[PDB]
Design a protein around this ligand. Structure first.
Ligand SMILES: Nc1ncnc2c1ncn2[C@@H]1O[C@H](COP(=O)(O)OP(=O)(O)OP(=O)(O)O)[C@@H](O)[C@H]1O
Ligand SMILES: [Mg+2]
Length: 274
């Protein structure tokens, strides 16, 4: 169970927008830290409506199951606040935000070594979840958070974490599912109960495509009906102009779930591309 945080000790500041049936805010948590020292900590607050009981139960279950698995590349959740008007997940605030924005804002500067490092780190996170047989369900660049920028001056590669899973694709409306083509794999579009570890392999592929496409979203030009038809006709994504990961993207995004490679194999492939 999550550590419970008092309503009183959270201040909501700026809106960072809306996610899938969530409102996101930057905030401050008043806390007694190590050594009984009082702290006021920058936090990310994810807000679910109490009235959507099924959605928040799914949201908070998923967040909890993953938070039981501490890892350097998985986002830290400090706890929850349910004593209020709403249900709130209190999470670490990640200084450089989402990868998808960052890729767009710094497209001109990001090169292949940076891309490789970030792909490697995501692959290691996904390896860890695979070993723990925990399905994330919502891997996309948006949900990669940049803890630390690259510093060439000093040799530091960037560092990333993968955010919490959100509401399960088993409980989300069909209409949201179709909107998330091509991250949601074809087998989950025909039946979301086909959700499986193989799901995350497909989405990982889609995320690599984003990582190589400067913040572009695959198939954004296509409406929901045409996205559905794209899977029905078994299309693949175009190779990015930066083609270095094109083969890995296609191998990952295999219409046969059984044939998608393990994350160990994905890591060895990434390592070899040096
Ligand atoms: N831990 C975090 N630190 C800093 N910024 C964050 C964090 N988590 C999310 N954000 C920012 O909040 C905004 C909304 O995030 P997002 O759309 O992922 O919400 P969400 O509730 O996680 O939805 P979904 O389940 O669709 O991912 C984005 O600008 C993103 O960069
Ligand atoms: Mg998210």
């Amino acid at each position: 169970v999550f550590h419970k945080i008092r309503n009183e000790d959270l201040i909501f500041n700026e809106s960072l927008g809306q996610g899938t049936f969530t409102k996101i805010f930057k905030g401050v948590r008043r806390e007694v830290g190590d050594y009984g020292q009082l702290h006021e900590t920058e936090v990310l607050l994810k807000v679910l409506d109490k009235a959507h009981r099924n959605y928040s139960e799914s949201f908070f279950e998923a967040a909890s199951m993953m938070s039981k698995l501490s890892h350097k590349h998985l986002v830290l959740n400090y706890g929850v606040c349910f004593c209020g008007d709403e249900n709130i997940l209190v999470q670490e605030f990640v200084k450089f935000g989402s990868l998808d924005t960052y890729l767009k804002k710094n497209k001109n500067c990001i090169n292949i070594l940076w891309k490789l490092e970030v792909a490697k780190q995501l692959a290691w996170a996904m390896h860890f979840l695979e070993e723990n047989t925990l399905i994330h369900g919502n891997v996309c660049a948006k949900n990669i958070l940049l803890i630390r920028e690259e510093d060439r001056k000093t040799g530091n590669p960037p560092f990333i974490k993968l955010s919490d899973p959100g509401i399960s694709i088993t409980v989300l409306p069909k209409d949201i599912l179709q909107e998330r083509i091509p991250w949601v794999p074809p087998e989950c579009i025909e039946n979301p109960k086909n959700l499986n570890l193989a799901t995350d392999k497909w989405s990982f592929g889609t995320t690599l495509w984003e990582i190589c496409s400067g913040g572009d979203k695959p198939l954004s030009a296509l409406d929901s009906q045409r996205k559905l038809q794209f899977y029905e006709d078994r299309h693949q994504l175009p190779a990015p102009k930066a083609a270095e990961l094109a083969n890995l993207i296609n191998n990952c995004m295999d219409y046969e779930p059984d044939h998608r490679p393990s994350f160990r194999a994905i890591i060895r492939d990434l390592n070899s591309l040096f």
